[PDB]
């Protein structure tokens, strides 16, 4: 909002007044990061100066003028800023005009969106045409092979979820061989979330964890000493560390907090790292669910984190470097080691030429990882990508589908993101979903391959827009501020 003060000879003065209006939590309205606001006028630039006192760090760039506000930056619930700004009348356009506020957020960040609903789709009483565009594509069991890494950019399928059940060769943690696996319909649940929500490759995921910790891995090796497993009547060996408080992903204490301040839009207050990560054996643990999007999203603050510095050079070096993996290689490190990792590497400014020009990324600047952590998930993420022949699938059943949106329920989100009754709502479209997507296989379940991302997108039609949040509060103001990759 901005408002004229005093109009006299030749000064003009508008008083620019931000907030949060916000009184209570609303969707991305929490907290307001601002990276810095620009107007324009051809007139000279007096002095700008805050309405309370002091006065804010300001630039002038011909017409444009670039304001910062430093440590006022950041906007909490009921949080009002007025600055004042005078102006010397000159040229044909004086007056302050054009405000545009910067969040500190990259603004060309992209979401590849997997698949949409068909248009005719409505809340309420749907047909079973609503829900599929083709019988035929939709069921489709033939596979495309396809090379995406940590961002499902081109999705091999609209509605399918393919995970690559491939035998890796590679050696896996100083393995003979090992098998990708699974290791419940939940977990798998938690990944199409992941997918759906994030644009986050579920192959990804499960490499990840298979490096981490053996999460999603089997093995031949007679070596390595772990839980029965059976695939195929043959005997498979899961190392897992199951008792381990970071899960199968590895998120540390410290990593889980961090994004937890980041994203308050997911994460509730009384989210507890150990309750979210540390799964077992048993396949109802709610840990199972939440982990892999926990993960998802530990993984999305990095991509976030660089698009907020880097800004518009993030997408130019996607399209500009001779490496096909490297976003992925540099994604993955920074799990590993830490977002400071990569802004250690100088990446995106000094070492711009030798990144950009580099066939493989990581062997150059020796992103090796602890224990060959990068080079270990490509491979694995290329070959579950690579494979056509067995793809994972399950049986979900209604009670399945339910206590999936219950944890994610009791586990994410705030109060006031969606409403007891906007939830209730959605539930019945998901359960009309359901019923009409069961018919084509008895009425006994949906496939979790085939329906299961349908399921997702008719629940997700009644979730807060837009479905990602930006980064936002105190910690993220000054990381993403000083963050230089
Ligand atoms: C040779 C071989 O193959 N051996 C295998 C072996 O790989 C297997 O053991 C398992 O290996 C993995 C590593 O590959 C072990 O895992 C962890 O993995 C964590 C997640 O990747 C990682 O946590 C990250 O560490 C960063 C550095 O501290 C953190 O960044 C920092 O966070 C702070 C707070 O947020 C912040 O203040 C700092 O600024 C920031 N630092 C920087 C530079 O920015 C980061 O937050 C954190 N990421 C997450 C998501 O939590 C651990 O560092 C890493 N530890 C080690 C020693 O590598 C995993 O623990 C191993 N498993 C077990 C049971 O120990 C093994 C399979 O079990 O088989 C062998 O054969």
Redesign the pocket.
């Known amino acids: 909002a901005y408002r004229i003060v005093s109009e006299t000879g030749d000064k003009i003065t508008v008083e620019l007044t931000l907030a949060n209006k916000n009184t209570h939590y609303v969707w991305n309205g929490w907290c307001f990061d601002i990276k810095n606001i620009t107007f324009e006028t051809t007139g000279k630039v007096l002095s700008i100066k805050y309405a309370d006192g002091g006065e804010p760090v300001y630039n002038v760039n011909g017409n444009l003028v670039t304001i910062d506000l430093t440590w006022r930056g950041i906007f909490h619930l009921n949080t009002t800023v007025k600055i004042i700004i005078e102006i010397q009348k000159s040229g044909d356009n004086p007056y302050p005009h054009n405000f545009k506020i910067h969040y500190l957020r990259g603004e060309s960040i992209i979401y590849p969106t997997i698949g949409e609903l068909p248009a005719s789709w409505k809340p309420g009483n749907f047909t079973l045409s609503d829900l599929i565009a083709d019988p035929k594509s939709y069921y489709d069991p033939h596979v495309k092979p396809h090379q995406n890494g940590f961002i499902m950019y081109n999705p091999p399928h609209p509605t399918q979820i393919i995970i690559g059940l491939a035998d890796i060769d590679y050696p896996?943690?100083?393995?003979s061989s090992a098998r990708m696996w699974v290791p419940n319909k939940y977990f798998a649940m938690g990944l199409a979330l992941a997918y759906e929500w994030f644009k986050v490759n579920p192959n990804f995921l499960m490499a990840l964890a298979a490096?981490?910790?053996?999460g999603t891995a089997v093995t031949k090796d007679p070596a390595f000493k772990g839980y029965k497993v059976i695939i195929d009547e043959e005997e498979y060996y899961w190392?897992?560390?199951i008792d381990?408080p970071?899960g199968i992903?590895?998120?540390?204490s410290?990593?889980?907090?961090?994004i937890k301040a980041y994203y308050p839009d997911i994460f509730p207050d009384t989210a507890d790292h150990d309750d979210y990560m540390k799964v077992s054996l048993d396949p109802n643990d709610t840990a199972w669910i939440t982990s892999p999007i926990v993960?998802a999203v530990?993984l999305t603050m990095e991509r976030e984190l660089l698009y907020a510095a880097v800004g518009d050079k993030y997408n130019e070096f996607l399209r500009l470097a001779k490496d096909p993996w490297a976003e992925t290689e540099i994604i993955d490190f920074?799990?590993?080691?830490?977002?400071?990792?990569?802004?250690?590497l100088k990446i995106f400014s000094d070492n711009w030429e030798k990144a950009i020009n580099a066939e493989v990324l990581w062997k150059e600047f020796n992103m090796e990882?602890?224990?060959?952590?990068v080079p270990?998930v490509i491979n694995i993420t290329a070959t579950m990508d690579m494979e056509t022949e067995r793809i994972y699938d399950a049986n979900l059943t209604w009670d399945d589908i339910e206590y999936f949106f219950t944890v994610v329920r009791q586990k994410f989100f705030r109060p006031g993101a969606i409403s007891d009754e906007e939830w209730n709502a959605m539930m019945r479209d998901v359960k009309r979903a359901y019923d009409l997507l069961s018919q084509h296989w008895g009425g006994d379940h949906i496939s979790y391959r085939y329906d299961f991302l349908t399921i997702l997108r008719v629940a997700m039609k009644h979730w807060p827009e837009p479905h990602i949040p930006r980064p936002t509060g105190d910690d993220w103001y000054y990381h993403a501020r000083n963050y230089n990759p």
Do not use: C, M
């Open positions: 896996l943690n100083l393995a490096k981490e910790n053996w190392p897992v560390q381990h970071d992903f590895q998120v540390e410290g990593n889980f907090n961090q993960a530990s920074g799990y590993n080691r830490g977002v400071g990792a990569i802004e250690a990882g602890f224990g060959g952590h270990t």
